[PDB]
């Protein structure tokens, strides 16, 4: 009975240190490890639930689950209901609930399948096969089902050692299965390994031998541990709610992500300007200093779309105010930014100063009157401590709080016309434990199982777990705090401005990308954090939050010039690109460095700006089809298993491979090149030529002034001319880069709209064009053409992989004004006067 191989031992004492005698008295097996792996573990006979009265419906299956012998946790729910819903050919959904009591559930809006589902009777389990090859994807029979009031555990075998997801943590893209405990409890902590960080996303994607994959989402917002072991297998261990489980069949990893996003929401479409460069620090302490940033960037020809402020603008660090010393003329500063074609962003905190004289601070006084705050045992506002001092915490599950937040945002916007909201401290972060008045002693504050959270308590760095919100207690709702503020702020900005919102949030939960973007928080200015930003940006793209990045050059500490060059090079490929800096750090704006470093930084921004029409098209694909913007090599080439562990390179979309230097003192880099021809993007004019790979590692020159970017053969990228803002760049002529296959084929596309309006796709207010290269011709195909796309000038076409110099180049049947061909690089560069919205044919021979 206790002959269980070491890797398949499931922990029977997750709750406390246990002796052999106590272990055996639990009905469990005791075998010390020989050097983590639990010593006390479940025999195959350990009491679980039994399946009874299974029946079938058009929808799927239902059954009763009964437990006869209590577990060692209090308040087992002995009778449960199983509902299995076979929702689409790719999505299976099951719930396990208490039929006798409504339990907390996360608020979320709603030929043969690829899966089959079977059941084990005793012990109970759910078994999910992939129909095509019979691979077992889920098998929950591997360990007991626990379902007690404050402890749910469900386990499964995994199909391979390769699993990604379960944000937010500082780790490789692929998670370690060597007895790893991953804790989801939103927490204000500077990113560091092994810790629960700012967000929680209870989703994983698991790879399968041969390159197929599936995904599993547990729709549960309670504090939870996910435990991975090397058999391989996984256990979800949550502290409340129900088991609400989705399985996404893929089979392609890209399809798994899209299917997940079909449930939680497709990413929101940002405004075009939001893809420009953003620049911020804590310490721009007046409007005069802040204006100097734009002046100094402009003088040195650095693009900058959006100027930001941190807390500096506020009156005594309070939301919806501005001080009358350094920021006396705040409204005029922001108006002037707009006059120059730029946008403005500033920090907003959730917590509202509660200490001012009554009647002197409207956000608090109104919030009090309307009952918008989270309250404590006696029904008064829970008071904690954040930047302004004593603060109350809005309850963004309360519809009245939603209205109050809309009003506060609209009123402040009437004074100062900011263009979005940077929402910070929304875990919610508390500088003291729980509240000024501590927390009561109850089961929510002191639960029977505490997940592996930093500080060993749910109260640490946050508010009391038993505090009251409109929908439920904070215990159940904590991991949604940031998300609910993001929803509230999205709506507030729609109402205040009437154009697309731009929200960047620290704390997140699954589905966040439907409303907002994210940055990775208070990362150190170190080579280590530069490198760790690549897997983290990739993770968030898999989780449907493509508008993500890290603070360029790092936030905490002092950057070095070399680090800031490399970070700016890589960071130009973050889908959200902002350089932000702490109060006590040395300056790190691009213009603050030496001339050579400035040149490298300028080149990085210039290239990003040239690529914006393409980056924006990629965001449109994310928004309409659940695609990723930045993606790991394995998403694009899953059938090449050498890609599975690669997380220090990234793709933009299908075709642009970025291979950054991530260490000090390097003048070369070694990166993986999937099967195909990869053209060096440096061979395209912007204002070894080709890697022929069999699927292999390649060492590339990478001096300080260089980042390696390659374009995949078969693809066409739209580009646009330069500007210091998107207001300027959007008016410039466009260009194509056309990467030919050996056989002469390529394809690409452009999506174009006005860059900020709401409901564009619903109203058809956009242009969509496909580009095709074939048989020594390049044409466009006009999927949709509207006024918004009209008048886009195409002035340059660059063709890569042209083997022989042409004797003639034609544009709509007329020999072109001029072209150049480089026999060394195989590049044909063609000057044209064409329109993206009008059918054209370019040819050469
Ligand atoms: C729920 O939240 C509310 C706030 O919304 C919270 O109210 C707070 O209650 C405490 C007392 O429980 C108040 O603290 C008092 O403040 C007064 C005046 O400043 C003092 O005179 C009081 O001193 C007493 O306690 C001292 C101990 O250090 C003794 O030495 C002294 O002799 C007094 O007996 C005391 O500090 C606090 O001011 C309010 N907060 C606000 C903003 O009004 C309430 O406690 C919360 N409820 C629960 C159950 O947590
Ligand atoms: C899902 O996982 C469960 C649990 O791991 C698997 O069920 C278990 O399968 C093993 C091996 O097939 C069984 O062990 C064997 O039992 C036979 C019969 O007595 C014995 O002769 C062998 O020595 C061996 O011990 C075990 O009985 C069985 N457990 C249960 C509860 O049924 C199951 O195979 C997995 N399902 C799939 C489709 O992979
Ligand atoms: C499993 O179901 C049986 C039978 O329930 C009957 O028909 C079902 C389709 C549904 O319509 C039920 O309402 C029915 O009762 C349960 O056994 C019955 O239990 C009731 C109440 O305890 C009793 O009066 C009947 O005599 C029982 N009938 C039989 C044939 O035994 C049984 O309790 C269910 N098991 C579990 C664990 O819930
Ligand atoms: C980041 O650097 C600041 C400033 O460092 C100073 O200026 C540099 C150009 C260089 O010449 C340094 O050696 C200088 O010390 C640090 O703040 C300083 O800290 C030191 C030591 O604690 C103190 O004596 C200075 O007075 C501080 N100066 C200022 C302007 O604050 C800061 O410590 C550095 N941060 C980290 C994490 O190392
Ligand atoms: C913008 O650039 C100006 C000019 O370089 C900076 O002003 C100088 O700052 C240095 C400090 O390093 C002083 O010693 C000089 O006296 C200043 N020169 C002038 C002409 O004022 C300014 O600090 C920069 N501002 C920002 C916000 O980066
Ligand atoms: Cl012992
Ligand atoms: Cl016990
Ligand atoms: Cl509830
Ligand atoms: Cl399949
Ligand atoms: Cl700081
Ligand atoms: Cl890698
Ligand atoms: Cl490197
Ligand atoms: Cl022409």
Residue numbers in the entry: 81 to 115, 123 to 197, 205 to 781, 795 to 952
Could you give the paper's own sentences about this structure?
GAA is synthesized as a 110 kDa glycoprotein, which is targeted to the lysosome via the mannose-6-phosphate receptor and undergoes in the late endosomal/lysosomal compartment a series of proteolytic and N-glycan processing events to yield a mature active form composed of four tightly associated peptides. The narrow substrate-binding pocket of rhGAA is located near the C-terminal ends of β-strands of the catalytic (β/α)8 domain and shaped by a loop from the N-terminal β-sheet domain and both inserts I and II.
This allowed us to collect the diffraction data extending to 1.9 Å and solve the structure of rhGAA by molecular replacement. In this study we employed in situ proteolysis to afford well-diffracting crystals of rhGAA and interestingly the crystallographic model we obtained corresponds to the mature forms of recombinant and placental GAA found in the endosome/lysosomal compartment. The overall architecture of rhGAA is similar to that of the human glycoside hydrolase family GH311 homologues, the intestinal brush-border enzymes maltase-glucoamylase (MGAM)22,23 and sucrase-isomaltase (SI)24. The precursor form of rhGAA contains ~14 kDa of carbohydrate and seven glycosylation sites have been predicted and characterized. We detected residual difference electron density at N882, insufficient to model a glycan structure, and did not observe difference electron density near N925. One of the peptide segments removed by proteolytic treatment (G116-M122) is specific to the lysosmal representatives of the GH31 enzyme family and its removal might be required for the generation of the secondary substrate-binding site in the trefoil Type-P domain.
